[PDB]
Amino acid sequence: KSPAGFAEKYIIESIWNGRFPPGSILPAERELSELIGVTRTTLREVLQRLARDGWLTIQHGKPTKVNQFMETSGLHILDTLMTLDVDNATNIVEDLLAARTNISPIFMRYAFKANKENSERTIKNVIESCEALMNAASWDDFIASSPYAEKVLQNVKEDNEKDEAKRQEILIAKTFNFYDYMLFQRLAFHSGNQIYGLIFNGLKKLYDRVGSYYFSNPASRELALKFYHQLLETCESGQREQLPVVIRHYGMESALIWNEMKKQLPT
């Protein structure tokens, strides 16, 4: 769908996986254009957006280079993080998603063990809210109920989509993501190790973008809700050993939904 979007995605992912290492000089524009298979004019502007997003270093009368990162530019991994999306950084997102599956069994294990009460409260609260989000006649109906109408309206907004039916779906997606984030992030802080909770805080904007996209699929919400229940039942039963299975199982099943939805992406 988008040749410009594809070129941006390729370069970014090439930098990410080390083909275009953070210090290196980018392949010549001619060779780079031939490589990715896009028009030379398209590539030349993609490089400029990519240098504004903080991936590249463009300079008059000099070879284009990949940026050094690691506080070299100062807040150089984060100014780029603001530009990350599902379209242009699919592999970066999937790595984060994989890591989320890998590490969740760790901090949720700590949380169910030292904060058995708090964990159950969190998961129950997410389940009730999500289940009230679904089942509702409309998004407004959900907001009209719910003890946290204020908190949700603060964090969930479209204000751009004007088609009533479409804005409704977007709001449902963002609201469900809102509670998915809450479940993982809050259980992360209940681990006793602030670093797990802090990671989610740092990545909330990207989290919101991918989540609002992922949970626009009804199956995504059904699967997650069912997964939340498994978490609750696993916690109250004190069955630790099942945690890595439940989470990895959900990671697998959510993976196949993700891959079906990965099709139809314009890049």
Ligand X SMILES: CCCCCCCCCCCCCCCC(=O)SCCNC(=O)CCNC(=O)[C@H](O)C(C)(C)COP(=O)(O)OP(=O)(O)OC[C@H]1O[C@@H](n2cnc3c(N)ncnc32)[C@H](O)[C@@H]1OP(=O)(O)O
**Residue 206 binds what, of ligand X, a second copy, none (CB under 5 to 8 Å, by partner type)?**
ligand X
Q: In whole angstroms, how close is the CB of 266 to ligand X at the nearest point?
A: 18
Give yes or no for residue 223 binding ligand X (CB under 6 A).
no
CA nearest 221: which of 254, 187, 186? 254
**Residue 80 binds what, of a second copy, ligand X, none (CB under 5 to 8 Å, by partner type)?**
ligand X
Q: What does the alpha-carbon distance between residue 73 and residue 99 come to, in Å, rounded to a whole number?
A: 26
Identify the residue among 6, 139, 142, 189 touching ligand X (CB under 6 A).
Answer: 189
Give the long-range contacts of residues 108-111, CB within 8 A, separation 24 or more: 108/187, 108/191, 108/231, 108/243, 108/247, 109/240, 109/243, 110/190, 110/191, 110/192, 110/193, 111/187, 111/188, 111/190, 111/191, 111/192
Q: In whole angstroms, how close is the CB of 41 to a second copy at the nearest point?
A: 31
Identify the residue among 25, 28, 82, 98 touching ligand X (CB under 6 A).
Answer: 98
DSSP string, 150-188: HHHHHH----S--SHHHHHHHHHHHHHHHHHHHHHHHHH
Residue with tokens 């209940």: 190
Q: In whole angstroms, how close is the CB of 98 to a second copy at the nearest point?
A: 6
Q: What does the alpha-carbon distance between residue 12 and residue 9 come to, in Å, rounded to a whole number?
A: 5
| Beta carbon nearer to a second copy, 153 or 195 | 195
Q: In whole angstroms, how close is the CB of 140 to ligand X at the nearest point?
A: 16
Residues 153-192 that bind a second copy (CB under 8 A): 189
CB atoms within 10 A of CB 155: 15
Q: In whole angstroms, how close is the CB of 225 to ligand X at the nearest point?
A: 12
Q: Are 201 and 185 in contact (CB under 8 A)?
A: yes
Q: Which amino acid is at 31?
A: E
Q: In whole angstroms, how close is the CB of 174 to a second copy at the nearest point?
A: 18
Give yes or no for residue 68 binding a second copy (CB under 8 A).
no
Find the part of the chain contacting a second copy (CB under 8 A) among 71-79, 179-187, 217-225, 228-236: 71-79
Positions in the binding site for a second copy (CB under 8 A): 16-18, 69-71, 74-75, 77-79, 82, 92, 95-96, 98-99, 102-103, 106-107, 189, 193-196, 198, 201-202, 204-205
